[PDB]
Amino acid sequence: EQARYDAERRQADEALAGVFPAVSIFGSARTPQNHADYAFACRLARRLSDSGIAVISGGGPGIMEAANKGAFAGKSVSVGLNIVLPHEQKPNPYQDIALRFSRFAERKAVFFRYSQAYVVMPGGFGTLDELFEILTLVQTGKVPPCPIVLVGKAFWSGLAEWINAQLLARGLISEGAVSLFAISDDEDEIVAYLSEHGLQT
Amino acid sequence: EQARYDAERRQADEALAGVFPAVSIFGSARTPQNHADYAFACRLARRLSDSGIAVISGGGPGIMEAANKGAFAGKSVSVGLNIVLPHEQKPNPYQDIALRFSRFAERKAVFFRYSQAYVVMPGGFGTLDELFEILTLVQTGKVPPCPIVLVGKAFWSGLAEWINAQLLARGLISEGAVSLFAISDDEDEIVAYLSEHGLQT
Amino acid sequence: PEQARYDAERRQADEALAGVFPAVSIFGSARTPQNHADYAFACRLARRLSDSGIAVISGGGPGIMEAANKGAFAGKSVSVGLNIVLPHEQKPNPYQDIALRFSRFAERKAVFFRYSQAYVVMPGGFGTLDELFEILTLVQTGKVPPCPIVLVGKAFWSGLAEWINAQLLARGLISEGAVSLFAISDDEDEIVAYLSEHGLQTA
Amino acid sequence: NTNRVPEQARYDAERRQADEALAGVFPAVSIFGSARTPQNHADYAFACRLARRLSDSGIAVISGGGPGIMEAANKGAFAGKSVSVGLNIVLPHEQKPNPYQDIALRFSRFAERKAVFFRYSQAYVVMPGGFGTLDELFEILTLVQTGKVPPCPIVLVGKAFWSGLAEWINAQLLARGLISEGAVSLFAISDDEDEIVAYLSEHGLQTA
């Protein structure tokens, strides 16, 4: 069992040893193909791929598929980190490097080892897990600083307002903690902000 | 490096092999000793410990110390899962079992392997990491169902309202997903709800 | 009359450095001669960081401070001197795009630690060790965000690191992670890779 | 810019509160050292006894007000005839004041805290400590070296603990010319309370 987890770790490290730079795109497994956010994530991933940036996603349906689809059609590699779950996430067919993980831990370690920026489409608890984990790892200095962009102002604004009204206001986090992420609805604004903060087109 | 992480994993498994049942208490490293939430978490942990439940916390300052302090004064073991960080978290002196982790991954694996319930005091990004990770692991069936209680209605309500208005409303999560957690300000309400949903006093 | 002067020096620095990001501070001895290997190393490093878009902040005097400003001044990014008023007057070196002045060490170090995202520490005396242990303390206690700290000169620094490991860490006077707060190197490539890999926003 | 009270107002207020409390406090010594030294460590007993001796000879004792050596210093000074001062620091991870302070002050930042140590002390005793202790040590050495504060005795306690550092200073700083021979003479190292007290008095600390 531990044997398998380590093996899945070693396979991902081999497969990705030559991949740089890279962005991770997170978001809902449930977003339909005809949704605005699906088209958005696909075109963004296409654009980033064509400027030499690899795209890593969870490799399943929904936003993971939109991201892989765009990047599969772009110049750079499309990477998928499929998670094995009772409620099955079928791997999408738009991956140059197709990896599989039995556990969330090794999956996220690959995300955070091999990415230098993060785009977060709207998602559920698992996307919020990813979001607050990378915020934690950055704030604590366990991974290097990197841009984190939430996409969808109507969706995300209420979370940011709650973070300011409750976490910042009570001193549970510092002012610089709130600055670790930005929110945007604009593809141009997003790609600019990513390169402005260290992503290497 | 990988050697050390595995070693820290094995030490925790040895140290905790005889500990059951158990609750985890999460919350801010920054909560001062004279805060209401600090007193609350301490008395709750005291009460739970006296009814035969072990208490696991992050083993550092703030809420982690309040929880260890109460449980250290209770009949059952007090457990601390200290995390090594640049911004140092000094281990508090109220731990029967004092463990140390170089990485968040092994630390949370111990939390989630050895607990059957969760109490979440107000906290920052790292507490939200823990919260949405256990929600994800439960919702996906990677760990068994278990009660998850957020403490502090004024603090937490705005997050729950955002989850309903945005995640549930858009179908990103199901109605049963929102039911995986409850919010309370009352020690009696909390201990009842914990045993009502499987915690074994 | 007095606090107002320090306030004005602080605001002058905030005004001047408002758009300056990213930035690295380089510390080291005022006494290092212009023909010394460490002077050349700091100059070459500062030039390379500068050409990668990183501003370079030094204490603005002679020695390592001048080597750092000289390399940064020749590079694409700005060269900042934080010049200190000493009873034995220290003359500012000629290689500053932004020349700031401070009556006290306190405001000077506050500016270093507010406007830098990484530190490179050449060999120096008591004033360099004040800076070094101050930034380590500020990081350890959560007053300043964690950032790369590189000590340059394996032979020069190794004795201090071995004493820290044996007599501080092994007595529990520092945390197990406190030794990971800094690295020691004397390869320019190694150092540039380390600064990038750990947060310094390199080109 | 938004209309707000400046951050600086807090540091000004904390410095004024310190000056109010310490106005008539003279002479005084600062005792530095690890927050982490156990109560049963030899360093803790040494610092407590020394602080009591200095206090009974008329010398106020200033420490950082927390646990460890700070608690040992304040404990000895509190029992002694002269005042026991704590310069407590406010940190994201709370540091709890020790119960042995006649004068208890609070600082939001290390800078104002150290300014108070250095304005109100005429001598320094440094028990073994970590990075924050070494910050204090090399900061006061720098301020004395450069003439920002008047000459004063600085004593490191524990020849064996400090020897590795003193040897490194000699082999690397002094031998490479980064400091002068006069610089090394700015601090003494001692194991002995009688020798320490004599040294402090010989270099200007006003004993009874």
CSV table of C-alpha atoms in Angstrom, one decimal, chain A:
chain,number,residue,atom,x,y,z
A,1,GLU,CA,0.0,0.0,0.0
A,2,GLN,CA,2.7,2.4,1.0
A,3,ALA,CA,4.7,0.7,-1.8
A,4,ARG,CA,2.1,1.8,-4.3
A,5,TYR,CA,2.0,5.5,-3.2
A,6,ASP,CA,5.8,5.8,-3.4
A,7,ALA,CA,5.8,4.1,-6.8
A,8,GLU,CA,3.2,6.6,-8.1
A,9,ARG,CA,5.4,9.4,-6.7
A,10,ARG,CA,8.5,8.1,-8.5
A,11,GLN,CA,6.6,7.8,-11.8
A,12,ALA,CA,5.4,11.4,-11.7
A,13,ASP,CA,8.9,12.7,-10.9
A,14,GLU,CA,10.4,10.8,-13.9
A,15,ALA,CA,7.6,11.9,-16.3
A,16,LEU,CA,7.9,15.6,-15.4
A,17,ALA,CA,11.7,16.0,-14.8
A,18,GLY,CA,12.0,17.9,-18.0
A,19,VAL,CA,8.9,20.1,-17.8
A,20,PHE,CA,9.3,23.8,-17.0
A,21,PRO,CA,7.8,26.3,-16.7
A,22,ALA,CA,4.3,25.1,-15.7
A,23,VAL,CA,0.9,26.4,-14.4
A,24,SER,CA,-1.7,24.4,-12.5
A,25,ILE,CA,-5.4,25.0,-13.3
A,26,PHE,CA,-8.0,23.9,-10.7
A,27,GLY,CA,-11.7,23.8,-10.8
A,28,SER,CA,-14.9,21.8,-10.7
A,29,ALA,CA,-15.1,18.2,-12.1
A,30,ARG,CA,-18.8,19.1,-12.8
A,31,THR,CA,-18.5,22.1,-15.1
A,32,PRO,CA,-20.3,21.2,-18.4
A,33,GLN,CA,-18.6,21.6,-21.8
A,34,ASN,CA,-21.0,24.4,-22.8
A,35,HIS,CA,-20.4,26.5,-19.7
A,36,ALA,CA,-18.7,29.9,-19.9
A,37,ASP,CA,-16.0,28.9,-17.4
A,38,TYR,CA,-15.2,25.8,-19.4
A,39,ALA,CA,-14.6,27.8,-22.6
A,40,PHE,CA,-12.6,30.3,-20.5
A,41,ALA,CA,-10.3,27.7,-18.9
A,42,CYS,CA,-9.8,26.0,-22.3
A,43,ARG,CA,-8.8,29.2,-24.1
A,44,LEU,CA,-6.6,30.4,-21.2
A,45,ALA,CA,-4.8,27.0,-21.2
A,46,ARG,CA,-4.4,27.2,-25.0
A,47,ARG,CA,-2.9,30.7,-24.8
A,48,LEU,CA,-0.5,29.7,-22.0
A,49,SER,CA,0.6,26.6,-23.8
A,50,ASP,CA,1.4,28.5,-26.9
A,51,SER,CA,3.7,30.8,-25.0
A,52,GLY,CA,5.8,27.8,-23.9
A,53,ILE,CA,4.1,27.1,-20.5
A,54,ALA,CA,3.1,23.5,-19.6
A,55,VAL,CA,-0.4,23.1,-18.1
A,56,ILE,CA,-1.1,20.7,-15.2
A,57,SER,CA,-4.6,19.7,-14.2
A,58,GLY,CA,-6.3,17.0,-12.3
A,59,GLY,CA,-6.8,15.1,-15.6
A,60,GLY,CA,-10.5,14.3,-15.2
A,61,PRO,CA,-13.7,15.8,-16.4
A,62,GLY,CA,-15.0,19.4,-16.2
A,63,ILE,CA,-12.5,22.1,-15.8
A,64,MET,CA,-9.7,19.5,-15.7
A,65,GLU,CA,-10.7,18.5,-19.2
A,66,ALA,CA,-11.1,22.1,-20.5
A,67,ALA,CA,-7.6,22.8,-19.3
A,68,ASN,CA,-6.1,19.7,-20.8
A,69,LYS,CA,-8.0,20.3,-24.0
A,70,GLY,CA,-6.6,23.7,-24.6
A,71,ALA,CA,-3.1,22.7,-23.6
A,72,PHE,CA,-3.3,19.5,-25.7
A,73,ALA,CA,-3.9,21.9,-28.7
A,74,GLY,CA,-1.1,24.2,-27.6
A,75,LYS,CA,2.7,23.9,-28.3
A,76,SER,CA,3.6,22.8,-24.8
A,77,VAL,CA,2.8,19.6,-22.8
A,78,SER,CA,-0.6,18.9,-21.3
A,79,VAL,CA,-0.4,17.1,-18.0
A,80,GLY,CA,-3.1,15.3,-16.0
A,81,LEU,CA,-2.9,14.1,-12.4
A,82,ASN,CA,-5.8,11.6,-12.3
A,83,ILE,CA,-7.1,10.7,-8.8
A,84,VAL,CA,-8.6,7.2,-8.1
A,85,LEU,CA,-11.9,7.7,-6.2
A,86,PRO,CA,-15.0,5.6,-5.6
A,87,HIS,CA,-17.0,8.3,-7.6
A,88,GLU,CA,-14.8,7.7,-10.6
A,89,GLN,CA,-13.0,10.5,-12.4
A,90,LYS,CA,-12.4,9.1,-15.9
A,91,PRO,CA,-9.1,10.5,-17.4
A,92,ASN,CA,-9.8,12.8,-20.2
A,93,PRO,CA,-8.1,12.1,-23.6
A,94,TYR,CA,-6.2,15.4,-23.9
A,95,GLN,CA,-3.0,14.6,-22.0
A,96,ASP,CA,0.6,14.3,-23.3
A,97,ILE,CA,1.7,13.1,-19.8
A,98,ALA,CA,-1.0,11.0,-18.1
A,99,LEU,CA,-0.3,10.2,-14.4
A,100,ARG,CA,-2.5,8.4,-11.8
A,101,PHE,CA,-2.6,8.7,-8.0
A,102,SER,CA,-4.3,6.5,-5.4
A,103,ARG,CA,-4.1,9.3,-2.8
A,104,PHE,CA,-4.6,13.1,-2.8
A,105,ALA,CA,-1.3,13.6,-0.9
A,106,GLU,CA,1.0,12.5,-3.8
A,107,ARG,CA,-1.2,14.2,-6.3
A,108,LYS,CA,-1.0,17.6,-4.6
A,109,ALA,CA,2.8,17.2,-4.0
A,110,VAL,CA,3.2,16.9,-7.8
A,111,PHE,CA,1.0,20.0,-8.4
A,112,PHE,CA,3.0,22.1,-6.0
A,113,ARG,CA,6.5,20.8,-6.8
A,114,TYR,CA,6.2,21.3,-10.6
A,115,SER,CA,4.1,24.5,-10.9
A,116,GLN,CA,5.1,28.2,-10.7
A,117,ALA,CA,1.6,29.7,-10.9
A,118,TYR,CA,-2.1,28.7,-10.1
A,119,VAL,CA,-5.4,29.5,-11.8
A,120,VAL,CA,-8.4,28.5,-9.8
A,121,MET,CA,-11.7,28.1,-11.7
A,122,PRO,CA,-14.8,27.8,-9.5
A,123,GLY,CA,-15.0,24.4,-7.7
A,124,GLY,CA,-16.2,22.5,-4.7
A,125,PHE,CA,-14.5,21.4,-1.5
A,126,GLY,CA,-11.6,19.7,-3.3
A,127,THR,CA,-10.8,22.9,-5.2
A,128,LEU,CA,-10.9,24.8,-1.9
A,129,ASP,CA,-8.6,22.2,-0.4
A,130,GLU,CA,-6.2,22.9,-3.2
A,131,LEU,CA,-6.6,26.6,-2.8
A,132,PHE,CA,-6.1,26.9,1.0
A,133,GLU,CA,-3.3,24.3,0.9
A,134,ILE,CA,-1.2,26.4,-1.6
A,135,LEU,CA,-2.0,29.6,0.3
A,136,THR,CA,-0.7,27.8,3.4
A,137,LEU,CA,2.4,26.4,1.8
A,138,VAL,CA,3.3,29.9,0.3
A,139,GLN,CA,2.4,31.8,3.5
A,140,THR,CA,4.6,29.4,5.6
A,141,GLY,CA,7.5,29.5,3.1
A,142,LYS,CA,7.2,25.7,2.4
A,143,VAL,CA,7.0,26.5,-1.3
A,144,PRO,CA,8.3,29.6,-3.1
A,145,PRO,CA,6.0,32.6,-3.8
A,146,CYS,CA,3.9,32.3,-6.9
A,147,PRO,CA,0.8,34.0,-8.4
A,148,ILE,CA,-2.5,32.6,-7.4
A,149,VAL,CA,-5.5,33.8,-9.5
A,150,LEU,CA,-9.1,33.0,-8.7
A,151,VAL,CA,-11.2,33.3,-11.8
A,152,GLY,CA,-14.8,34.4,-11.4
A,153,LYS,CA,-15.5,37.6,-9.5
A,154,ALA,CA,-19.2,36.9,-8.8
A,155,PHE,CA,-18.2,33.4,-7.6
A,156,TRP,CA,-15.1,34.3,-5.5
A,157,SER,CA,-15.8,37.8,-4.2
A,158,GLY,CA,-17.9,36.6,-1.3
A,159,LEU,CA,-15.0,34.4,-0.1
A,160,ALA,CA,-12.5,37.3,-0.2
A,161,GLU,CA,-15.0,39.6,1.6
A,162,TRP,CA,-15.4,36.9,4.3
A,163,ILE,CA,-11.6,36.6,4.5
A,164,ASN,CA,-11.2,40.3,5.1
A,165,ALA,CA,-14.2,40.7,7.4
A,166,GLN,CA,-13.3,37.7,9.6
A,167,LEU,CA,-9.7,36.4,9.2
A,168,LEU,CA,-7.9,39.7,8.6
A,169,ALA,CA,-10.1,41.8,10.9
A,170,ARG,CA,-9.4,39.4,13.9
A,171,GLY,CA,-5.7,39.3,13.2
A,172,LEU,CA,-5.7,35.6,12.4
A,173,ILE,CA,-3.8,36.4,9.2
A,174,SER,CA,-1.7,39.4,8.2
A,175,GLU,CA,-2.4,42.0,5.5
A,176,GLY,CA,0.3,40.4,3.3
A,177,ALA,CA,-1.5,37.1,3.6
A,178,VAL,CA,-4.6,38.5,1.8
A,179,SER,CA,-2.3,39.8,-0.9
A,180,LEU,CA,-1.2,36.2,-1.8
A,181,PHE,CA,-4.1,35.9,-4.3
A,182,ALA,CA,-6.0,38.0,-6.8
A,183,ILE,CA,-9.4,37.7,-8.5
A,184,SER,CA,-10.1,38.4,-12.2
A,185,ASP,CA,-12.6,37.7,-15.0
A,186,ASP,CA,-10.3,38.8,-17.9
A,187,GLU,CA,-7.9,36.6,-19.9
A,188,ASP,CA,-5.6,39.5,-20.6
A,189,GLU,CA,-5.5,40.7,-17.0
A,190,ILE,CA,-4.8,37.1,-16.0
A,191,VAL,CA,-1.9,36.3,-18.3
A,192,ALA,CA,-0.4,39.7,-17.5
A,193,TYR,CA,-0.7,39.2,-13.7
A,194,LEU,CA,0.9,35.7,-14.0
A,195,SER,CA,4.0,37.0,-15.9
A,196,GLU,CA,4.1,40.1,-13.7
A,197,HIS,CA,4.7,37.8,-10.7
A,198,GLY,CA,7.3,35.4,-12.1
A,199,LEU,CA,5.6,33.1,-14.6
A,200,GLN,CA,8.0,32.6,-17.5
A,201,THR,CA,6.2,32.8,-20.9
